[PDB]
Write a protein that binds this DNA or RNA. Structure first.
Lengths: 205, 82, 85, 80
RNA sequence: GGUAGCUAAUACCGCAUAACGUCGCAAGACCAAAGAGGGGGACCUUCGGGCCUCUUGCCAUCGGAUGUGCCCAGAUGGGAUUAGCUAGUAGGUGGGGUAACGGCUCACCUAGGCGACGAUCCCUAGCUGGUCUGAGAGGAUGACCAGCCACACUGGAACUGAGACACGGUCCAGACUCCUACGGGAGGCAGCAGUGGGGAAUAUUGCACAAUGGGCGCAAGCCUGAUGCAGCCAUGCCGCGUG
RNA sequence: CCCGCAGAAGAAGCACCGGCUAACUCCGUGCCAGCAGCCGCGGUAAUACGGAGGGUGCAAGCGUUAAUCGGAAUUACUGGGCGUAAAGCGCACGCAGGCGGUUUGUUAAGUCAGAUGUGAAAUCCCCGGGCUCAACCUGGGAACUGCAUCUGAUACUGGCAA
């Protein structure tokens, strides 16, 4: 699975920073925003309603780095549960282990967080977790064992983490590269750019 | 006759038994009269995994039923307390 | 075919012979008692019933007639014979 | 008690035989209308008491002969 | 296959016994069966055994459960370019046959029964708990897993047995094949594997009785393509890796 | 199922790019060669035919076909229509069906309440448990939208009498 391609192509096509490159110079020479690449991508494409829906789906999909079948199953599960559909879907998607690892700050990009997960690094309750499709439960512990200790990657990530906003629902912790999960995140802390309803409308048809 | 046998419904390499009372001539997991309990051999550290209803099996013994070896060992293992 | 059923077949034919003999006995006595009934006599038919009862009851108790046919025969014959006198 | 049904004769008289019909409403499973429905049996009687066009109850008993399985008990509103 | 002569047994058959059993308004008549084994200080022994014990088995009753055998009522595809069907057909009377009422069969007497609220007659299909689809109503469908029927080369019959008209149990008729000294005889993979052949096209002439179950045996034990595991097939549903 | 070995190594394809429906520019072909599900596109400038480069959609799969349902309110009960389009018989008269003005009593057959028995266990659903995560197995409820019986209710139809 996985993308395995030119990521800034999707960064430029979408038209907004996708937070998935995350170097040090988050500057123009990296991105060349608002170009819409291609042979003659200078022209304005004059989107339509179905195009708006599809583009929003593409953005929400690529931000969290998931394929199609998993996303459809996630929508099914979210709709089965009670409550507002969009908020429940975003809350459920946020619960993925790779995303919470990134938000804790042990990495720089979600993809590298997944790379760390696949190589038997992250630890919980004294038991190794293999996969990033794991669903974290409330009141759990995130930690790193000693085989992957003293790796400069985690220290660099910890130092560069503070540039972000350190969401309130999670405790930053990180006194001894150890953390603590508290509760399900909610609408307020996450960015308000994403519009939930349009995805549901798209799956309506 | 009327006996108390064992039947399984689990997946490959993962047994899950279900003690039941039925006729001898019928199949393993087929026609049955009434379920009475279950036993999980692999089980776990958790205590649950061995339950019965002593009243119904006692009544069925009174009506004239017989016993199998594994279920006899099980009931000897549990009894009311052991 | 080669199985264990050969001795079963032999036992079956021997049982056939024995049961046919007993059935012929039964039928001969039933025919004689009906003949006596048709004759119209009372004493002779009553006597014939008298020696006839034990053999039919014996065949019933042996396990060859299911124990209920004998009662039907006896009751019907008694009802038939008592009226004509 | 003993379950009973009520019906109508509309039948000729054979030797110790009458035929009866019974009625009841029912809801059609599709269109919601109510339609009269008729069912017919055969009865074993005694002394051919009942006559054409009479109202009589009925009850079931041991099978006597082919298609004859119910017998009468009481007759009410004798004659027309 | 036949003839002659030998031998046991829980095989088989007479007698003894006989009642909450059978037949009977009433007396009354009648019915059945079996030994082995583990020990044994005292006793008899014509030293085998009797004799003292204990486990199982046989024959009658009356009862418990568990399956099977019957009846009725209501639902269960398409065609009026299928309108009249039906004498054992519908009842009554008496006999015979089943575990039992019964046209289940017999001889007699009646003049009936079914039908426009679909009878007879055609074409088509195993039936449900369900599956798929759609919001609901519906509409197609009966793959695997459960429940029930009807079927074992094609036509028919029964014996045996507690329980078949019996899937690897008999007897005929038929047609296929295979052996025959040519006078006759054997045989039914639609049971798990597999070949030939139809097709768009579906698997390997595999392991184990250790787990559960089934049938024998007081048990130890014996079988068991039931089963529990294998090998193949991107055929679906999954989860992962290609930094 | 755990521990160890220098080791980037041993691993990506397939459809579409006129509208319906996300994305375009060049060269050769020039009513021949051809596509295509409907509209149809092709005689010198093809955003539709062949190649090249770019883009778009899903990914250990992707496209083609065969078959079923909704979009279909295109069999219409919940939910359509009959002056001029596809549609009111040529008219009347009347059995079998269907349906009925308006009072007062009786009746419990419809109908409505309550209880009991029964709708086999899988599945469909909700709380949880387990296999590192799901697929998958499973503890307890839920409904099987009915059927039958018994006790009650009497406004409306139904049978009764005036």
């Amino acid at each position: 699975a996985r993308y395995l391609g030119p990521k800034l192509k999707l960064s430029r096509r979408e038209g907004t920073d996708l937070f998935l490159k995350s170097g040090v110079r988050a500057i123009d020479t990296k991105c060349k925003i608002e170009q819409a690449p291609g042979q003659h991508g200078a022209r304005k494409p004059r989107l339509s309603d179905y195009g708006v829906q599809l583009r929003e789906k593409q953005k929400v999909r690529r931000i969290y780095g998931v394929l199609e079948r998993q996303f459809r199953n996630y929508y099914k599960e979210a709709a089965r549960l009670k409550g507002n559909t969009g908020e429940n879907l975003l809350a459920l998607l946020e619960g993925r282990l790779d995303n919470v690892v990134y938000r804790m700050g042990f990495g720089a990009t979600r993809a590298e967080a997944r790379q760390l997960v696949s190589h038997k690094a992250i630890m919980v309750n004294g038991r190794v977790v293999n996969i990033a499709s794991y669903q974290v439960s409330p009141n759990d512990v995130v930690s790193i064992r000693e085989k992957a200790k003293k790796q400069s990657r985690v220290k660099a990530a910890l130092e560069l983490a503070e540039q972000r906003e350190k969401p309130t629902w999670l405790e930053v912790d990180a006194g001894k590269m150890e953390g603590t999960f508290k509760r399900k995140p909610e609408r307020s802390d996450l960015s308000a750019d994403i519009n939930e309803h349009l995805i549901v409308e798209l799956y309506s048809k | 006759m009327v006996t108390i046998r064992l039947a399984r419904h689990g997946a490959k390499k993962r047994p899950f038994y279900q003690v039941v009372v039925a006729d001898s001539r019928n199949a393993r997991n087929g026609r049955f009269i009434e379920r009475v309990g279950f036993f999980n051999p692999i089980a776990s550290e958790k205590e649950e995994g061995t339950r019965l209803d002593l009243d119904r099996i006692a009544h069925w013994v009174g009506q004239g039923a017989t016993i199998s070896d594994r279920v006899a060992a099980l009931i000897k293992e549990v009894n009311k307390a052991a | 075919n080669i199985k264990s059923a050969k001795k079963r077949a032999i036992q079956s034919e021997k049982a056939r012979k024995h049961n046919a003999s007993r059935r012929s006995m039964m039928r001969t006595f039933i025919k004689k008692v009906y003949a006596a009934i048709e004759a119209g006599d009372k004493a002779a038919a009553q006597k014939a019933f008298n020696e006839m009862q034990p053999i039919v009851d014996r065949q019933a108790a042996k396990g060859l007639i299911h124990k209920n046919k004998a009662a039907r025969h006896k009751a019907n014959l008694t009802a038939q014979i008592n009226k004509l006198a | 008690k003993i379950r009973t049904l009520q019906g109508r004769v509309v039948s000729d008289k054979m030797e110790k035989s009458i035929v009866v019909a019974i009625e009841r409403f029912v809801k059609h499973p599709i269109y919601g209308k109510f339609i009269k429905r008729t069912t017919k049996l055969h009865v074993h009687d005694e002394n051919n008491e009942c006559g054409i066009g009479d109202v009589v109850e009925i009850r079931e008993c041991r099978p006597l002969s082919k298609t004859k399985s119910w017998t009468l008990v009481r007759v009410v509103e004798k004659a027309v």
